[PDB]
Amino acid sequence: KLDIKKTFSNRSDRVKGIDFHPTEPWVLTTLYSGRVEIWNYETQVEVRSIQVTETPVRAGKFIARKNWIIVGSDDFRIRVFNYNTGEKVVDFEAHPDYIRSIAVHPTKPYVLSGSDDLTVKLWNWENNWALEQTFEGHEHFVMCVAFNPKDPSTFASGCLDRTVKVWSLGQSTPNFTLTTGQERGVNYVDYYPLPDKPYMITASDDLTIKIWDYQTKSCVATLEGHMSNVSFAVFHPTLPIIISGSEDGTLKIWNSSTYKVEKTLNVGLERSWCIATHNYIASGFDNGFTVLSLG
């Protein structure tokens, strides 16, 4: 029932991270300028705005059950803010290099950060934000981390070393390493959220999106059409579609059964960097963000 309606678009400095609040009509953007913005996209008024640092903030997530946002920046630091009171509840150096990605466990007090220091780190906010584990094995920047929603005792890391690695919490080596054949690296990895397919999806600078059966490790499909680096590709949680975005300036919506492109959108904000799904979706670009309703 595709009726792509424009909910709220605003101009800003380059949006590197983006996330939806699960119960309030809010979107968080994290900017290359070091600023982060929480917008109510129904009233189109900012609920909170922070100049966090002067370095890019590439990663940001709500932690709704604690009334927090958590962000990571190129100054090597993870910071957490209560979005109700605005005050900074934690501020620590997480890696000795850029932070690319942050994932929040859906029930347990765990945060994963992936970094240019070649590692993923696990932080426990009920143990004083202690470093509980470092996952070592990747050979280049870890660009993306994501829990398996159907078994969040495992998670995947996407890396510029051209691999995805799937790990078990508390275990020192990958359960398996996925050789993608995406020779310019993996920028993003996402899980299909429903129980009927054991699918992961990867995006690459080599212009491809690939679908993976994580039980057999086989490539199910390869999605081609983007004309520059693919920043992300995700399964929509409720619609039978895949959504991707690229430095060619476009969003693409693909059929998740046939793997053929259904729609290409140039929202006029130059290169696309990040994605969030709530049929709301939101993407951050060089020149701002857009919140879209698909139906």
Partner 1 sequence: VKLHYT
Residue environment code for 103-129, b if the CB has 16+ CB neighbours within 10 A, otherwise e? bbbeeeebbbbbbbbbbbbbbbbeeeb
CA 119 to chain centre: 17
Does the protein bind partner 1 through residue 143 (CB under 8 A)?
yes
**Mapping DSSP to helix (H, G, I), strand (E, B) and coil, where does residue 251 land?**
strand
Work out how close the CB of 183 gets to partner 1 at its nearest, in angstroms, rounded to a whole number. Answer: 14
The residue assigned the tokens 């520059």 is 228
> Are 159 and 142 a contacting pair, CB within 8 Å?
yes
With binding defined as CB under 8 A, does residue 235 bind partner 1? no
CB of 142 to partner 1, least distance (A): 11
Beta bridge partners of 179: 163
d(CA 36, CA 12): 10
Number of residues that bind partner 1 (CB under 8 A): 10
For partner 1, the closer of residues 152 and 249 by Cβ is 249
Compose the 90-129 pattern: x for residues touching partner 1 by CB under 8 A, - for all others. --------x-x---------------x-------------
Q: How far is the CB of 40 from partner 1 (least distance, A)?
A: 29
Question: How many Cβ atoms are within 10 Å of 93's Cβ, its own excluded?
Answer: 9
Q: In this structure, what token pair is assigned to residue 241?
A: 């579609």
Is 101 or 244 the residue whose CB approaches partner 1 more closely?
Answer: 101
CA 1 and chain centroid, separation: 26
Assign 184 to helix, strand or coil: coil
Per CB under 8 A, 14 contacts partner 1: yes
Q: Please, what is the minimum distance in Å from the beta carbon of residue 140 to partner 1?
A: 8
The site map against partner 1 for 26-55 (x = CB under 8 A) is: ------x-----------------------
62 near partner 1 (CB under 8 A):
no
141 sits near partner 1 (criterion: CB under 8 A) = yes
Gyration radius (Cα) of the chain, Å: 18
187 binds partner 1 (CB under 8 A): yes
Contacting positions for partner 1 (CB under 8 A): 14, 32, 98, 100, 116, 141, 143, 160, 187, 271
